[PDB]
Structure 1
C-alpha cells in the first residue's frame, strides 16, 4: 500500500533530478539541496513517500534525522565520479551500520550512465562492496535520471520487497 523511502547519496549524484523526473515527468532545474525535498510517487498501486535528502558533505551529519521508519533506502551514485566512489562507499556503509535502518532494503541507483566512460553497474557493485551486505536485501540499477531509464525497474524491485514482507 505505502512505502517510506530515504534517498541519499553524495551531492551532485542526481537525487533531486530523480525525484521530480518520477513525480512530475520533468527534468527540473536544481541547485544543491540544503535540507530535503519530499514527494509521494504513486506507482503500481503503491504510494512511495520519497525523502530526497541533500548530500553536501557539511550536511551529511543530518542524514540520521531521517532514518526512523524508512522501509527502503535508495542510494544514488554518480557513475561518472570515479574520484569520489570510495567516499560514496564509505558514506553508504556508515549509514548501513545504523540500527534504525536494520530492516530497510537497499536500492542502489548507478546514475549518469549517459556520460562517456561512466562506471557500469558491475563496476559500481564491486567498488561499493555490495556483496558484503549479507543481512539485507539489496539491488543495483543502472540509471539515467534525465531520460528516466532504469528508474521504473528500481520501483519494480522496491514494490516486490514491500509485497514480500
Structure 2
C-alpha cells in the first residue's frame, strides 16, 4: 500500500514514466518486485533489448540494463530517472559512473529528477552512500535535482525513503 499511496497525487491521465536503469545485477528487478505495484512484464521491442515494466494506473516503472538507440522513444514522458548501483561492485563502479553520465546528457532527459539507489548495503564491504556519491561524481551535477539513498533491496530498506523523495519532486 505504502508505495501506491506515494503516487496518489500523480494519479490522473497524463502517463508519466519512471525509468530505472543501471548495470546488470545492480538489483533493479528486485526493487520492482518489492514495490508490489503490479506484475513485472518483460517485452523485447528490438532484438537484444529486454525491457521490464510495472504499470500502476497512469504511472509506469520501466527497467533495462545499461552497459556493455530505441531508448529515445521512452524518454518523452520520463519524469524521473532512478539509477541503481551495486555498492559492493568496486570493479565496475567506474563503468556505472560512465553509464549514469551518458544517460544524463540525453537532451530528452534534461528536466528529469534523478534518484540514485546505492544498493546492497547489507554486504560487509559495500561502499557507503558518501563513497558512491564520490565515485559517481554526483556533486558535479549542477543543474540537476538529485538525491542518493542507501538501500538493501532484498529487505526493502531505503526504498520507501528514496521513492518518497522522488514522488515529492514530481508533485
* Shorter-chain TM-score tier: 0.7 to 0.9
Aligned-partner Cα distance in 1 for 2:47–2:125? 30
Distance 1:37 1:30, change over 3 A: closer
Determine the structure 2 residue equivalent to 1:31.
44
Distance 1:92 1:39, change over 3 A: closer
Aligned residues: 157
1:68, CA displacement in angstroms? 2.1
TM-score (norm 2): 0.74
Aligned-partner Cα distance in 1 for 2:114–2:106? 13
Structure 1 runs not aligned, ≥5 long: 56-60
Distance 1:32 1:21, change over 3 A: farther
1:64, CA displacement in angstroms? 4.0
Contact 2:41 2:52 in 1 (8 A): no
Structure 2 runs not aligned, ≥5 long: 1-14
Contact 1:17 1:30 in 2 (8 A): no
Q: Deviations over 1:33-71 (max 9, x none)?
A: 99788788799998867778898xxxxx55444322200
Contact 1:79 1:124 in 2 (8 A): yes
Answer with 24-33 or 148-157: which moved more: 24-33
Contact 1:4 1:49 in 2 (8 A): yes
Contact 1:108 1:139 in 2 (8 A): yes
Cα RMSD (Å): 4.1
Aligned-partner Cα distance in 2 for 1:105–1:86? 22
Distance 1:149 1:84, change over 3 A: same
Determine the structure 2 residue equivalent to 1:80.
88
Q: How does 1:103-114 map to 2 (within 5 A)?
A: 103-114=111-122
Distance 1:100 1:30, change over 3 A: closer
1:159, CA displacement in angstroms? 1.4
Determine the structure 2 residue equivalent to 1:52.
65
Partner SS state of residue 110, structure 1: strand
